[PDB]
Amino acid sequence: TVRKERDGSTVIRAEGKDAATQVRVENGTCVILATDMGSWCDDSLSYECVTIDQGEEPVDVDCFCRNVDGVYLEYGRCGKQETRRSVLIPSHDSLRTHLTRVEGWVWKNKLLALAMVTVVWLTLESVVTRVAVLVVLLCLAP
Amino acid sequence: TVRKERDGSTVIRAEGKDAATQVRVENGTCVILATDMGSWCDDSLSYECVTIDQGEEPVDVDCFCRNVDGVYLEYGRCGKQETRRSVLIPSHDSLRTHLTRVEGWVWKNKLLALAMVTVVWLTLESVVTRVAVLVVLLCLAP
Amino acid sequence: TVRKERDGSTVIRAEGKDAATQVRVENGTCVILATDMGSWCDDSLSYECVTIDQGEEPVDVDCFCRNVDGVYLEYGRCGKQETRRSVLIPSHDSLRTHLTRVEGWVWKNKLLALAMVTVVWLTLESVVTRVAVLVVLLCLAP
Amino acid sequence: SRCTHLENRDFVTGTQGTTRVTLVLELGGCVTITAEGKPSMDVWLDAIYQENPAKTREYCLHAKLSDTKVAARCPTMGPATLAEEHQGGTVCKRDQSDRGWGNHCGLFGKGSIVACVKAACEAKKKATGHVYDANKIVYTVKVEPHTGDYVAANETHSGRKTASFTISSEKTILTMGEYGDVSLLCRVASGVDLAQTVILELDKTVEHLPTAWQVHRDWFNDLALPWKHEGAQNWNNAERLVEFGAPHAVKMDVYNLGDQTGVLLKALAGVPVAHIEGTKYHLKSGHVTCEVGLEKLKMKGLTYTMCDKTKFTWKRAPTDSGHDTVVMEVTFSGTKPCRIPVRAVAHGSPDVNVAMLITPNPTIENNGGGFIEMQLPPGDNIIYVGELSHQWFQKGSSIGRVFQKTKKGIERLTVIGEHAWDFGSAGGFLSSIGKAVHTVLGGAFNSIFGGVGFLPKLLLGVALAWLGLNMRNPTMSMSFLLAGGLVLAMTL
Amino acid sequence: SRCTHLENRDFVTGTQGTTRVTLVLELGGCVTITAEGKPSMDVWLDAIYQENPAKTREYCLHAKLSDTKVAARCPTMGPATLAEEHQGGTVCKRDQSDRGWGNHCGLFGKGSIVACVKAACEAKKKATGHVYDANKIVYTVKVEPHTGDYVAANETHSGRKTASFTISSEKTILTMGEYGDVSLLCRVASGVDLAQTVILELDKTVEHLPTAWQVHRDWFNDLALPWKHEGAQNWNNAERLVEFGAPHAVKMDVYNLGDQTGVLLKALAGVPVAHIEGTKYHLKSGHVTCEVGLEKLKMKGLTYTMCDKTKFTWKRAPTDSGHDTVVMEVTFSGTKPCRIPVRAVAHGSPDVNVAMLITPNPTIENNGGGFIEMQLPPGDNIIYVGELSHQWFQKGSSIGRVFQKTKKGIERLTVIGEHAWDFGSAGGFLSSIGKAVHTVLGGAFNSIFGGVGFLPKLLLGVALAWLGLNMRNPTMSMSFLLAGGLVLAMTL
Amino acid sequence: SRCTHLENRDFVTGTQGTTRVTLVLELGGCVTITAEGKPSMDVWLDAIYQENPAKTREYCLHAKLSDTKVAARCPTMGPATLAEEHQGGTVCKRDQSDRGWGNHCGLFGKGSIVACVKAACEAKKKATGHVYDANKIVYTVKVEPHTGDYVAANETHSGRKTASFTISSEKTILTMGEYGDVSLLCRVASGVDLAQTVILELDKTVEHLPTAWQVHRDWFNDLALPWKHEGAQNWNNAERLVEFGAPHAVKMDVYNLGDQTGVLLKALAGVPVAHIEGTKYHLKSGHVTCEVGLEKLKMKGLTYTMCDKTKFTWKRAPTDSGHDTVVMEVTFSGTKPCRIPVRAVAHGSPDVNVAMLITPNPTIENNGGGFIEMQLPPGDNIIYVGELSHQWFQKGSSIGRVFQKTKKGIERLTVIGEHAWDFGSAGGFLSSIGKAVHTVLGGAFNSIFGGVGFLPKLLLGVALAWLGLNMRNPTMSMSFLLAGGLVLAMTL
Ligand SMILES: *[C@@H]1O[C@H](CO)[C@@H](O)[C@H](O)[C@H]1NC(C)=O
Ligand SMILES: *[C@@H]1O[C@H](CO)[C@@H](O)[C@H](O)[C@H]1NC(C)=O
Ligand SMILES: *[C@@H]1O[C@H](CO)[C@@H](O)[C@H](O)[C@H]1NC(C)=O
Missing domain, CATH: 1.20.1280 (Monooxygenase)
Structure with a gap:
């Protein structure tokens, strides 16, 4: 298929069966080396089709038209079967923790534990209740 | 351009100028479609050339032949102007330093050095061994 | 347009419509491939148009002539629809100031604030001069 | 009553000569309210739900590309520009291509190339995310009045009534019809921080299940997919579902990453399925602490005469109900209606009543009646309805009851x-x-x-x-x- | 009188028997010279400006390229050279380039290439600067007398005069008409770091605004653009507005960065536009420590008659001026000229007046006359003018006045x-x-x-x-x- | 003497009645042996080298592909294989590719595709690596005798003699013509950790300078490049220099990453370049501890008489030698050969021999001689050579000499x-x-x-x-x- 845009540039609206064909446009003729075409729909690619002299051959091109200027191939990529990779999304002891948390607080606060022990030892003077005082102090840092 | 190998298959040998043409083989027609060819050399890629029925168009290929079986393509990749990613190669007196380190520690540890000096000068009573004590006191920090 | 300068070197004054055509000089011919030409102006980009033999095709060359030596191209650039960039241009009472800084320093040193009194009220015991001493101490901190 | 078939049962009874009692209602846990000289009522938090919750953010899982274009220029001719480049809702990239001899570029080198495509992902694939709002939640608390009729677990009592309770609303009055009225003053409270949980809902397609979940707020906010807030059509950060192939001389293909609902399903295995129906979104963590008023209720059928002495039989023999009480069913064959005579005594002390009926003033109605629920002191247990006699021996001790x-x-x-x-x-x-x-x-x-x-x-x-x-x-x-x-x- | 409408006002009183007064003037401030038995002048700095400051250097924001040339030589031929390489006013860079059998140079490798173009920038795009000169500055101070006519907040005064002052010339004498001669010997001080200020003036544009600016000298001396001093044909350092394309065999294009006025304007957001008036360049901060002479000032209308006390009527009620002063105005339509027997008596002291007139002997003239300003002690007072009367009280205390x-x-x-x-x-x-x-x-x-x-x-x-x-x-x-x-x- | 030039020159004196003397020798340093009654030698370490060091591992940069191939089969019809898949010197990758109507396969499945290629990297682009062998390192020590012939800083004395020294070989004796024999017995070492230094040299090239380095083993052993061992045809892990493209049905391209010389050279910027001379791999550290047996030396030219004391002229005046010693070249004119009567006297004691001769019995031969080096005490003095006499003062200051x-x-x-x-x-x-x-x-x-x-x-x-x-x-x-x-x- 061929058309004519308002700006003076042709549009070779190709399709699946046009692969490896030789379409004729204006004073010249040209081909379509693309080999992934399909039907026509919203999913439509449209890239410039180069123009080369007679004494030349294409290099890494899919459409090339000689003896004509401004040819834009345009084909729908849908109408065939499925290139695609999924994105990576991450997937979604009653007293055990208390003892561990208290031990961690003591270790990271050895000065605090030493001060708490020395308080009962010297100022509080509660050897009978020193165990209770130490337990309360430890519970003060859950 | 066309060679009949001894294994029962035909290999089409193409140059850069032969892109997007139709070359006859045996009884069928092979239409070279790949466009990134070049002058022959050691670097030669050779891939199977598909064969398709009368009423089927090609998709996702760049070499197809009709009513002829067992055709292979082959073309070099030299002469053509030249994914060039690059790998990652990571790049790469005796007591004077000790005396320098001690001087730097004293300069940046004014408080501790002053405290040590005051302690020595206030509780030494060892002017004979004052230097010996101070040497160890100053050099201990590392 | 062609013309031979006094030095013995020919110059071609290409125009906008001269794109992709031939120009005959002396006995050889010149080929123009530039696609950035336009009407004549002071914006003249005159550069050497290398000449080659008949055995090699041009590479990386816009203008090339055969069977002629010493030919220079030259053309204007106005009357042509348009690459721009931008350079880096960096974007463009007194007692209270001291009083505010002093108040901030006092408020950031609550321990120092307490120590100031703990030292003055004991060592100085000279309220008449202790006020001045405390003021000097407070002003000492920047 | 409906509450005879539930595990979590509490006998929150007001003191002697009391007119109101404080209640705590946890979903699934009934409560039985009794009061001397008044009918007894059963209440429970039926369900907690919000309707039409606000939607916070939308992810979509299948991009729908269209109108993709490409442009290129020979080297030393400036960059390539497209109209779609500066528009809204377009994904595109700028690259360089190896132009040379075969592309009719005079100077061998690198030339600019741009491929820009309009991106607006498909319909029936948006992963809508709703957010719970504390203020607008609505609670429902039924009220079932005790009668003489047994009710199965599935069956619903005809006389049951329902009420609503929002945080703003405080006072409500219910009509029990023949039994009078009940006044509810309920204070609602949510025991969990709802701001840290967001319900994720795929668009409603019934091809498979499930299509709703409760997910941690951070995880749902850190999904690597295009996201738009309601109102602005353009999809922010739409590049996540489009990849650009290597550039050829003049053509730069634009692939599509395709559907991605499958990976999302595979990543939500084992997550609780949010339970919703219609336009209501249920919850699972809440409780309403109410203050029931029992002043306007009037006991029914106080004028009924005694029933027949010998026309009483056991439809269902007495059995324990796992709630420190005994159920009992009877039939009748004499003239009806009439009040059911029921009493309990202790062996060796046959002139003392130990029957404290949970159901008030049992009666026989023309349609329904005979159900009895009561609690007996541990030890000797005898039942005297008409002339029927049953032997029971309840475990435990009064001290145990007080402690419990x-x-x-x-x-x-x-x-x-x-x-x-x-x-x-x-x-x-x-x-x-x-x-x-x-x-x-x-x-x-x-x-x-x-x-x-x-x-x-x-x-x-x-x-x-x-x-x-x-x-x-x-x-x-x-x-x-x-x-x-x-x-x-x-x-x- | 005139500056009664201003905010920053000061009162300077000359002691009796004194023939001079020291004073300080600054922008947006007035003064009211007052002395016994002498007219009360007003002095207030009007504006400080310079005439055609010496322009220092010019940045032009659009380099008009022209006459570009290129030439190259392949290996085994020596480095390439061009005539314009060492000529003035031209800029260019030498770079390697590829060669081969395709362009007549048999040996492969990297050659040499040069491409030089004349650099010049057209008119209407020069961002010429300006710098002040300490001595050349001109300070003008205006002195006007007190006439009994009320003057609007913007209307001029026929009797006012003007004088100019600079560091070089100090003394001068004025003449106010019939009032006398006022001699000012002002020594001026530039109150700004003038060495660190410059005017970045874009060239004339009728519609686009603004054009003038003030920028710290360091910034204006660091702009990354071509610069030259006036009278230099070339453009020193002209490579800042030219970028060279890649080396393609023999061709090497020389692109143009285009206009830069947009970026410069974008970089001067929120910068105070420098006042410009004709050829005068205005400063904004400064002060004058001037000495005012009063040797030969004569007060007017000392031997006038007296208006009949009955015939008087108001035009404006007394109001608080804003500087602890009372501003009053009257209009009379009888026999002229005369005097106004103004007097205000403190409550309880009908005989003693406590009103000291700022206006020197208020008088009624053929044109004007009647506006009278007074300063009164705090308390309740009654203002007497002929037979007119009013009740007025002030705010504050005399201690406040002393402290102020x-x-x-x-x-x-x-x-x-x-x-x-x-x-x-x-x-x-x-x-x-x-x-x-x-x-x-x-x-x-x-x-x-x-x-x-x-x-x-x-x-x-x-x-x-x-x-x-x-x-x-x-x-x-x-x-x-x-x-x-x-x-x-x-x-x- | 070749030691009259080096900046650092250690002096060692032969004590009276001594026949053995220890030494310490380091690169760029010599020790002037002097003993009483014996000629004075020069001993230094010319250079340390190893010859034909073992080759441990040779990386190569520019991979050279060749004879690539592919193969594929219709879906669900068995995997594809290749004759080159299981051979050596190959890099093969497997993958699956789409298929459909245009691939001449019935069902729209996805079959198997295999593609791979030989990989032997380009010649003259290898980066070999050698490691020193500690026991095979050869140390060169060259001993020169003292003769009256002046020697330029870059001239070889004819009498220079060489000696090799390894860990195993210990004792070796040299011959020096007429002077005698010096018994060298040295023990060697090497400061640089030979186990932590591998010399890297890429194949010979003219443009690429330098072409050798010294690099840490823990770095050269983990270069992300192909590697083999000397004498192997195939290359291990050649896949690091080939990139496989996406499959298009039957064909998948195999790219090449090009050479890496640029990256390697960039990564070695600012690294020492190891001295190389043909097949000799030099070092830059280490020292030789040795002892010398002077027992077998004989002083030369002792039979000669003394020339007359009036036939001498200076050709090189006395000058500081940089080591607190004097040097002077004197040319004779009378009969030859003969001795050189030279003496020095302290100012004030003109009849005492004070010179400490360094050259042994300075003499003039048939053709050659006249170079005299001496040490003098601090202070002024006069140097006598027959009729001649020169003034000189020594800067040493004795105590400084003792401390040094x-x-x-x-x-x-x-x-x-x-x-x-x-x-x-x-x-x-x-x-x-x-x-x-x-x-x-x-x-x-x-x-x-x-x-x-x-x-x-x-x-x-x-x-x-x-x-x-x-x-x-x-x-x-x-x-x-x-x-x-x-x-x-x-x-x-
Ligand atoms: C309730 O369940 C019982 C037993 O499962 C059944 O017999 C009865 O019909 C059910 N009733 C209703 C209303 O579902
Ligand atoms: C400014 O002056 C004009 C006449 O010169 C006068 O009409 C106007 O009222 C004045 N402006 C104000 C604010 O009074
Ligand atoms: C020694 O070096 C100098 C300058 O470096 C040179 O002139 C001289 O020729 C060299 N020695 C000899 C024997 O050539």
């Missing part, structure tokens, strides 16, 4: 502690302390004090106070405190 | 610090100390002491000196310093 | 003591103590006792010991220690 009631009351006071204490002022603090003490000691006062009356309770309190004032060690203050607590409980 | 005068004196002495005293000689130091003391205590002495006379001042000084030498605490001799200060103030 | 000798002895003990530590038994301890004392204070003892002799030295030691034996303070006991030290140095 005290523990249950303490636990209930622990659940509603947030609103069970007020520290705004001194009078409010005293009121909160008194309410807490009443809640704690209600079971003890009810069990210990039965038929005591004002004079006996007052005399006991006076004796306890005198004991507190009696000569003893300072540790005796516990006895004085107990005396004061008992006196206060008797006063209220 | 002291603060104003301190501020005035602080701003003249650079030229307030000198210790070159003992006599000069003594004179400077006396001048500073007078400046700091003149208002206090005038307000506290008025019309006492030489004899009262001598008696007060003697009594204070005797009191200082009398018995008192060792450190309680501040009376001596007070007596010394009072004697010094009253010495003049 | 002590410092040099301490440095030599520190450098060499690491290996010269004997403590096997009592004899070993005595030997170690004696060696330490000698290496520490040999110069001090020689200078302290200059010409005293064995008997005078013993007498001085006896006197010092007798003085020390006298009772005094503990610090005074050091006299005995000094006597013992002098005796041991004067008797060992």
Whole structure:
């Protein structure tokens, strides 16, 4: 298929069966080396089709038209079967923790534990209740 | 351009100028479609050339032949102007330093050095061994 | 347009419509491939148009002539629809100031604030001069 | 009643001569309310739900590309520009391509190339995410009145009624019809931080299940997919579902990453399935602490005469119900309606009544009747309905009942502690302390004090106070405190 | 009168028997010279400007390329050269380039190539700067008399005059008409770091605004653009507006970065537009420490008749001016010219007036006359004018007035610090100390002491000196310093 | 003498009655052996090298693909194989590709595709690596005798002799024409950790300079490139230099990453370049500890007479040699060969021999001679050569010389003591103590006792010991220690 845009540039609206064909446009003729075409729909690619002299051959091109200027191939990529990779999304002891948390607080606060022990030892003077005082102090840092 | 190998298959040998043409083989027609060819050399890629029925168009290929079986393509990749990613190669007196380190520690540890000096000068009573004590006191920090 | 300068070197004054055509000089011919030409102006980009033999095709060359030596191209650039960039241009009472800084320093040193009194009220015991001493101490901190 | 078939049952009964009682309602846990001289009612938090919750953010899982274009220029000719480049809702990239001899570019080198495509992802694939709002949640609390009819677990009592309760709404009145009215003053509270949970809902397609989930807010906010807020059509960060192939001379293909609902399903295995229906979104963590009023209710059929003495039979023999009570079903063949004669005595003491019926004034109706629920003291247990006699032996001890009631009351006071204490002022603090003490000691006062009356309770309190004032060690203050607590409980 | 509408106003009173007054002027501020039996002038700096400041250097924002040439030589031929390489006004870079069998150069490898183009920028795109000169600045101060006609907030005054002042010329004399001659000998000080300010003036554009600016000298001296001094044909450092394309065999294009005025305007957001008036360039910060002469000022209308007391009527009610002054205006339509027997009597003192007129002997002329401004003590007072009357009270206390005068004196002495005293000689130091003391205590002495006379001042000084030498605490001799200060103030 | 040029020159003196002398030799350093009655030699380490070091691993940069291939089969029809898949020197990758109508396969499945290619990398682009062999390192020591012939800084004396030294070979004796034989017996070492230094050199190239480096083993052993061992045809892990493209049905391209010389050279910027000369791999560290046996030397030209004292002229005037010694070249004119009568006298003592000749018995041969090097005491003096006489003063200042000798002895003990530590038994301890004392204070003892002799030295030691034996303070006991030290140095 061929058309004519308002700006003076042709549009070779190709399709699946046009692969490896030789379409004729204006004073010249040209081909379509693309080999992934399909039907026509919203999913439509449209890239410039180069123009080369007679004494030349294409290099890494899919459409090339000689003896004509401004040819834009345009084909729908849908109408065939499925290139695609999924994105990576991450997937979604009653007293055990208390003892561990208290031990961690003591270790990271050895000065605090030493001060708490020395308080009962010297100022509080509660050897009978020193165990209770130490337990309360430890519970003060859950 | 066309060679009949001894294994029962035909290999089409193409140059850069032969892109997007139709070359006859045996009884069928092979239409070279790949466009990134070049002058022959050691670097030669050779891939199977598909064969398709009368009423089927090609998709996702760049070499197809009709009513002829067992055709292979082959073309070099030299002469053509030249994914060039690059790998990652990571790049790469005796007591004077000790005396320098001690001087730097004293300069940046004014408080501790002053405290040590005051302690020595206030509780030494060892002017004979004052230097010996101070040497160890100053050099201990590392 | 062609013309031979006094030095013995020919110059071609290409125009906008001269794109992709031939120009005959002396006995050889010149080929123009530039696609950035336009009407004549002071914006003249005159550069050497290398000449080659008949055995090699041009590479990386816009203008090339055969069977002629010493030919220079030259053309204007106005009357042509348009690459721009931008350079880096960096974007463009007194007692209270001291009083505010002093108040901030006092408020950031609550321990120092307490120590100031703990030292003055004991060592100085000279309220008449202790006020001045405390003021000097407070002003000492920047 | 419906509550005879549930595990979590609590007998929150008001004191003698009381008109209101505080309640704590946890979904799935019934409560039975009783009051001397009044009919008994059953209540429970049927369901917690919000309707039409606000939607916060939308992800989509299948991009729908279209109108993709490409442009290129020979080297040393400036960049390539497209109209779609500066528009909205377009994904595109700028690259360079190896132009040369075969592309009709005079100068060999690198030339600019741009491929820009409009991106607006498909329909019926948006992963809508709704967010719960605390204020607008609505609770439902049914009220089933006891009658003489047995009800199966699935069947719904005909006389059941329902009510609504929002945080703003405070006072509501219900109509029980023949039984009168009930006044509800419910305070609602959500026990979990709802701002850190967002319900994720795929667009409603019934091809498979499930299509709704509750997910942690951070995880749902850190999904690597295009996201738009409601109102702005353009999809922010749409590049995540489009990849650009290597550039050829003039053509730069634009692939599509395709559908991605499958990976999302595979990543949500084992997550609880949010339970929704219609336009209501249910919850699973809540409780409403209400204050039922039992003043306008009137016991039904107080004028009915006695039934037949010999026309009574057991439809279903008495059996335990796992709630420290006994069920019992009977039929009738004489003239109806008439009040059911029921009583209980103790072997060896055949002239003492020990029947404290849970159901009030059992009666036989023309359609329905005969259901009986009651609790007996441990030990000798005899049933005398008409002339039928059944032998029962209930385990446990009265001390055990008192201890269990005290523990249950303490636990209930622990659940509603947030609103069970007020520290705004001194009078409010005293009121909160008194309410807490009443809640704690209600079971003890009810069990210990039965038929005591004002004079006996007052005399006991006076004796306890005198004991507190009696000569003893300072540790005796516990006895004085107990005396004061008992006196206060008797006063209220 | 005129500056009664201004905000930053000051009152400077000259002591009786004194023939000069020191003063300080600054932008947006007025002064009201007042002396006994002499017309009350008004002095207020109008504007400070320079004439055609010496332009320093010019940045032009659009380089007009022209006449570009290229040439190259392949390996085994030596480095390439071009005629314009060492010519002035041209810029270019030499770079390697590829070669091969395709362009007649048999040996492969990298050659040499040069491409030089003339650089020049068209008119209407030069961002020429400007720098001030310390001596060339011109300061103008306007002095106007007091006429009894009310003047609007923007209307001029026919009688006002003007004078110009600069560091070079100091003295000058004015003539106000019939009032007399006012002599000003002002020594000026530039109050800004003028060495660190420059005017970045874009060239003329009729519609686009703005054009002038003020920018710190360091910034304007660091702009990354081509620059030259006026009178230089070339453009020093012209490579900042030219980028060279890749080397393609022989071709090497020379792109143009285009206009830059947009970026420069974008980089001057929120910068105060520099006032421009004709060829005058205006400053914005400065002050003048001027000395005002009063030797030959004559007050007008001393021997006029008296208007009949009955015939008077108001035009504007008295109102608070805003500087502890009362502004009043009247209009009369009878026999002219005459005097206005203005007087205000404090409540309870019908015989004693406490109104001191700022207007010198208010008078009714053929044109104008009637506007009278007064300053009155705090309290309740009744303003009398002929037979008209009004009831008015002030705010604040005389102590407040003394404190305000002291603060104003301190501020005035602080701003003249650079030229307030000198210790070159003992006599000069003594004179400077006396001048500073007078400046700091003149208002206090005038307000506290008025019309006492030489004899009262001598008696007060003697009594204070005797009191200082009398018995008192060792450190309680501040009376001596007070007596010394009072004697010094009253010495003049 | 080739040592009259090097900046650092250690002096070692041959003590009277001594036939052995230890040494320490380092790169860029020589020691001028001088002994009484024997010719003075020069000893230094010319250079350290290894020959044909073993090759450990050779990376190669520019991979060279060849003879690539692919193969594929219709879906669900068995995997595809290749004849080159299982051979050596190959890099094969498997994958699956789409298929459909255009692939001549019935069902729209996805079959198997295989593609791979030979990989032998380009010649003259290998980065070989060698590692030094500690036991095979060869140390070169060259000994030159002293002759009256002046030698330029870059000229080879005809009498220079060479000697090789390895770990195994220990003792070697040289011959020097007429002078005699020097018994060299050296022990070698190497400071640089040979196990942590691998020399990397890429194949020979003219443009690429430098073409060698010294790099850490832990870096050269983990280069992300293909690697093999010398003598292997195939390359291990050649996949690091090939990138496989996406499959299009039947064909998938195999790209090439090009050479890496640029990246490697960029990564080695600022790294030492190891000296290479043909097949000799030089080093830059290490030192030789050696002892020399002077027993077999004979002074040259002792039979000659003395020329007349009036036929001498200076060709090179006396000048500072940089090591507190003088050098002078004198040309003769009379009959030859003969001796050179040279002497120096201190100013004020013109009849005492004071010069300390360095050249042994300076002489003039048939053709050659006249270079004289001397050491003189601090202060002025006159140098006599027959009739001639020159003025000169020495800057040393004696005490500085003694201190420098002590410092040099301490440095030599520190450098060499690491290996010269004997403590096997009592004899070993005595030997170690004696060696330490000698290496520490040999110069001090020689200078302290200059010409005293064995008997005078013993007498001085006896006197010092007798003085020390006298009772005094503990610090005074050091006299005995000094006597013992002098005796041991004067008797060992
Ligand atoms: C309730 O369940 C019972 C037993 O499962 C069944 O017999 C009865 O029909 C059910 N009733 C209803 C209303 O579903
Ligand atoms: C400015 O002056 C004009 C006449 O010169 C006058 O009409 C106008 O009222 C003045 N502006 C104000 C704000 O009074
Ligand atoms: C030694 O070096 C100098 C300059 O470096 C040179 O002139 C001289 O020729 C060299 N020696 C000899 C023997 O050539």
